[PDB]
């Protein structure tokens with residue numbers, strides 16, 4: 001195809017520039033990683049995974065029978081940070097709404113010891129969860145790089161993680177966020193508001209009509225009065241610019 005890589009690089013940098021943030025999107029094609037955006041050096045820097053960890057929390061919870069995909073986690077009736085969270089949901093609904101109370105309950109069912117062992121076993125990020133089973137993904141000590149995140153998405157997309165195949169398919173079904181003319185986008189968003197500066201994530205893959213999977217991971221700095229939806233907007237623009245969707 002005819003567009004220069006100079007032009008692709010410049011167009012993708014501009015999407016980050018126009019959102020007035022600093023960020024990177026890593027794309028993996030087969031075994032080859034490509035890094036785009038306006039702060040390339042973020043690629044191998046460690047950030048908290050924030051809600052991207054829901055993906056692994058779900059794998060672990062499901063593998064270890066801490067929940068089923070149809071179980072309804074009841075709202076306890078206490079005020080939640082966001083009103084969309086004050087309702088009863090499955091893991092899948094909770095994943096789409098990035099509902100931390102559901103995933104905090106799941107983590108507590110799993111428990112500190114099984115959680116530390118499982119995160120070590122899958123080798124996620126720096127693999128350190130500390131001593132608090134319900135908050136290690138927001139504010140430390142667990143960290144991961146944008147490169148390690150596309151490599152996780154690539155593992156999940158191909159069923160290579162060390163979990164039952166059915167566990168992995170179950171979670172993957174939870175992650176479908178967009179269909180764009182025959183392509184399907186599976187991804188999990190992330191927003192660490194605790195840490196300073198804030199981190200935004202969108203990690204996932206595109207499944208093309210012909211079955212090919214192209215993993216990506218977007219990582220940027222969120223600032224106050226950014227809508228969470230630039231994460232998606234920058235991502236879809238980047239994938240469209242590259243002819244992936």
Ligand SMILES: *C(=O)[C@@H]([C@@H]1NC(C(=O)O)=C(S[C@@H]2CN[C@H](CNS(N)(=O)=O)C2)[C@@H]1C)[C@@H](C)O
Pocket residue numbers: 050051052082097098099100138189190191192193227228229
């Ligand atoms: C985890 O990162 C964090 C969740 N995650 C998100 C998120 O959007 O990734 C939120 S923001 C909350 C849920 N989505 C609503 C906004 N929609 S959008 N399209 O982003 O504008 C509000 C929340 C901080 C957990 C750990 O708190």
